[PDB]
Design a protein around this ligand. Structure first.
Ligand SMILES: [Cl-]
Length: 95
């Protein structure tokens, strides 16, 4: 059975820590984007975005997407990333 085999697979490998690592890397990427490319906030005001191991990090990201007028929400992560990269590129082009 597919579901029974999935429970066996989960015992072979618990993906939780790797999903957590991916979240961290994703958050670090957002932080680098804000710090070096979007630069929407004052540097003093990026502290909450920077605190990537916080369980409240998504709340801050939601405020960030609002603050830069991103048309996507956090739940649409792939679209938010692409949009923020597009914004970063347009901000970067022409010094
Ligand atoms: Cl998030």
């Amino acid at each position: 059975n597919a579901f029974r085999r999935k429970l066996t697979a989960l015992d072979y490998h618990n993906p939780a820590g790797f999903n957590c690592k991916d979240e961290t890397e994703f958050r670090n990427f957002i932080v680098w984007l804000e710090d070096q490319k979007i630069r929407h906030y004052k540097i003093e005001d990026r502290g909450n975005l920077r605190n990537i191991h916080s369980s409240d990090w998504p709340k801050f990201f939601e405020k960030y997407l609002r603050d830069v007028n991103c048309p996507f929400k956090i739940q649409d992560r792939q679209e938010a990333i692409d949009w923020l990269l597009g914004l970063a590129v347009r901000l970067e082009y022409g010094d």
